[PDB]
Amino acid sequence: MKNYQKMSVAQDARVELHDSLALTGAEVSINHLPAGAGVPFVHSHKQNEEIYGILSGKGFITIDGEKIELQAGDWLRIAPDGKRQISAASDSPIGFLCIQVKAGSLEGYTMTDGVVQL
Amino acid sequence: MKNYQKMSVAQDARVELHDSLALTGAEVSINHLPAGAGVPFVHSHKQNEEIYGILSGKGFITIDGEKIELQAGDWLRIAPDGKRQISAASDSPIGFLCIQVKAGSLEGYTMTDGVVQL
Numbered sequence: 001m002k003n004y005q006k007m008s009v010a011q012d013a014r015v016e017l018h019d020s021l022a023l024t025g026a027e028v029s030i031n032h033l034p035a036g037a038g039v040p041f042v043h044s045h046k047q048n049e050e051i052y053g054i055l056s057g058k059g060f061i062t063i064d065g066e067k068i069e070l071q072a073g074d075w076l077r078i079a080p081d082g083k084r085q086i087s088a089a090s091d092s093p094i095g096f097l098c099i100q101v102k103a104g105s106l107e108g109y110t111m112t113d114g115v116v117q118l
Numbered sequence: 119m120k121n122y123q124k125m126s127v128a129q130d131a132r133v134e135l136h137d138s139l140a141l142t143g144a145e146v147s148i149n150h151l152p153a154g155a156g157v158p159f160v161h162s163h164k165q166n167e168e169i170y171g172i173l174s175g176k177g178f179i180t181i182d183g184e185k186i187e188l189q190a191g192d193w194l195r196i197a198p199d200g201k202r203q204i205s206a207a208s209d210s211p212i213g214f215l216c217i218q219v220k221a222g223s224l225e226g227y228t229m230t231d232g233v234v235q236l
């Protein structure tokens with residue numbers, strides 16, 4: 001079969017890409033919280049590093065008791081042990097990406113993994 | 119020390135996050151091409167799976183001779199062997215994310231990797 005899979009996601013749709021795109025190196029979740037709302041729980045990871053990318057709006061994320069302000073354009077790496085909990089701003093919703101990957105699994109990349117054709 | 123790292127990226131800035139955020143499970147590149155422009159070369163990967171997310175605009179991506187139309191909200195998985203080359207539309211720029219991760223490296227995730235804190 002094809003060396004790729006594609007799908008379209010609505011502007012304000014909440015979905016996970018792993019099963020729909022048959023990912024093998026990560027899980028990607030697209031989500032967003034309305035103003036004044038936030039993830040109702042705190043969590044960490046056993047072996048997965050997590051990368052957050054704020055696509056729109058603004059808000060906060062509490063990591064190990066410390067709350068960090070967030071706005072569109074902000075990107076964060078969170079180690080497995082980090083206890084996290086994101087939430088939207090009081091006067092604004094927030095849209096973000098959560099890339100889950102096995103910590104320390106990356107080897108070569110770009111220069112050391114890409115192959116130019118002819 | 120801290121269990122996280124943060125940085126801000128300008129709306130139209132082109133950067134790679136691996137070194138700046140000290141990622142260990144992936145490389146994330148944020149890029150965008152002006153109307154009528156495109157990556158000047160074709161490439162594949164030795165062992166990294168690649169996930170593309172179109173954040174804005176529209177364009178095309180040619181994978182193994184087949185060109186696929188792209189627009190904001192589109193997400194794709196590309197296997198290592200896939201020969202790819204993205205470009206913007208003739209009448210519009212395109213902004214996208216390229217998540218590079220080692221293919222088949224993901225094990226548990228979400229339900230099988232997240233840990234809720236009481």
Ligand SMILES: [Zn+2]
Nearest residue numbers: 114161163168
């Ligand atoms: Zn690549």
Ligand SMILES: [Zn+2]
Nearest residue numbers: 043045050232
């Ligand atoms: Zn998580």
